[PDB]
Amino acid sequence: SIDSALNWDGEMTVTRFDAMTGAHFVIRLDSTQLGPAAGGTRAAQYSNLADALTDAGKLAGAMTLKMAVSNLPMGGGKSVIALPAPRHSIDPSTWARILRIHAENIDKLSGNYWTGPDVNTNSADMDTLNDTTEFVFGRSLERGGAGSSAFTTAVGVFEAMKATVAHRGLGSLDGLTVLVQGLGAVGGSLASLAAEAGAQLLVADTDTERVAHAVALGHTAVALEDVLSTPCDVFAPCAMGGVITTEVARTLDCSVVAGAANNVIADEAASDILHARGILYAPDFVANAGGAIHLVGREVLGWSESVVHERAVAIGDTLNQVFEISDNDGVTPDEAARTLAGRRAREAS
């Protein structure tokens, strides 16, 4: 309900409703402790407004931890645009109006929130926001931004994956079966990187053309209905979050979970179940941080493309630290990553 969604502990919630387009807007700032809150804009259809608020809150909390654990001097926030219809069907006029409105909202926060792309938003959209507000990462190269962060995210997830498989004792990825759920911007790149390292890929996507392309490349399609029941060495969720529910955690047939999606774990019990079953999960907020490293590194810290690459690869080392903590203290990898995030943040202050 709205009441439960409003019982959230973050720093601020910004909302707006635009009767003309019928769109609802949410900006959640989980924390501004390390710096202004930063996070992308997701646009999707939600069943109830409450869902958009809850997703924004979980996404914003993930950004706070992602920044902290990755030694990025930013807080965490997220924007969710609850669409009046499927993205597909939204006309250009309506989408342009929605973006102008979102930009006005960001603008009022005057630098306390910096946006970027997320699901259903791109660099062209970031250039549009930027026509109205300064606080946007991810603009096109021509507009002064760093462009797509997808590739860097993939590199980071792939390095997360290699470090995870290694710590789990499976050796290298050559020969291992990897199931990639979601062949999007990040997923498609991750599939190619894993393939080049010798993995056998199993893939799934609601978009049939994407699947056909992967199959043309030698991969094996998996029916959507069987994704969570398919045996594999590594399950790589690269679509939406909330995939690993307590029920799915009890029956997942794999040894490692390492993907790009945000908020992979639907509930705490699910995290405790994977840990107890010996399935090594590389925490989402650590593993998928290459996108933030690329945007913040490039646009805020002035790092070179080379250095961003290096920091993304370093996600493997961060995870080795997380696993180290998990093994020594007897806690799940998610809890150990939160601990590490806290240590890093403190150090960074």
Ligand X SMILES: NC(=O)C1=CN([C@@H]2O[C@H](COP(=O)(O)OP(=O)(O)OC[C@H]3O[C@@H](n4cnc5c(N)ncnc54)[C@H](O)[C@@H]3O)[C@@H](O)[C@H]2O)C=CC1
Ligand Y SMILES: N[C@@H](Cc1ccccc1)C(=O)O
Phi, psi at residue 221, to the nearest 5°?
A: -75, 150
* 38 contributes a contact to a second copy by CB under 8 A: no
* 110 contributes a contact to a second copy by CB under 8 A: yes
The listed partner (a second copy, ligand X, ligand Y, none) that binds 49, CB under 5 to 8 Å by sort, is a second copy
Using the structure block, give the residue that is written with the tokens 């908020």.
Answer: 263
Phi, psi at residue 178, to the nearest 5°?
A: -120, 125
How many chain residues bind ligand Y (CB under 6 A)? 13
Please count the other Cβ atoms lying within 10 Å of the Cβ belonging to residue 212.
12
Buried b (16+ CB within 10 A) or exposed e, 124-138: ebbbbbbeebebbbb
Secondary-structure percent of the chain, ordered helix, strand, coil, rounded to 5: 50, 15, 35
Residue 162 annotated as part of some ligand binding site: no
* 57 contributes a contact to ligand X by CB under 6 A: no
Q: Which of 58, 78, 108, 162 is catalytic?
A: 78
* 204 contributes a contact to Na ion by CB under 5 A: no
End-to-end C-alpha distance for the chain, whole angstroms: 38
Nearest to 201 by CA among 191, 189, 193: 191
Helix (H) or strand (E) segment spanning residue 264 = none
In three-state secondary structure terms, 79 is: strand
Count Cβ atoms within 10 A of the Cβ of residue 198 and give its class: 0-12 exposed, 13-18 middle, 19 or more buried: exposed
The listed partner (a second copy, ligand Y, K ion, none) that binds 7, CB under 5 to 8 Å by sort, is a second copy
The listed partner (K ion, Na ion, ligand X, none) that binds 240, CB under 5 to 8 Å by sort, is ligand X
Respond yes or no: is residue 162 known to be catalytic.
no
* Cα 234 to the center of its chain, rounded Å: 18
Out of 167, 219, 275, 344, which residue is the one contacting Na ion (CB under 5 A)? 219
Residue 48 CB, nearest distance to a second copy (Å)?
A: 7
Interface map 6-25 toward Na ion (x if CB under 5 A):
----xx--------------
User: 116 or 188, CB closer to ligand Y?
Assistant: 116
Helix (H) or strand (E) segment spanning residue 122 = none
Strand pairing partners for 41? 79, 117
Tell me which stretch binds ligand Y (CB under 6 A): 26-34, 113-121, 189-197, 210-218: 113-121
User: 69 or 179, CB closer to ligand Y?
Assistant: 69
Catalytic residues, by residue number, are: 78
Q: Site residues (CB under 8 A) for a second copy?
A: 2-3, 5-19, 24, 29, 32, 48-50, 104-105, 108-112
Per the annotation, binding residues are 42, 66, 117-118, 149, 153, 182-188, 205-206, 210, 239-240, 260-262
Q: Site residues (CB under 6 A) for ligand Y?
A: 38-40, 66, 116-118, 137, 149, 262, 291-292, 295
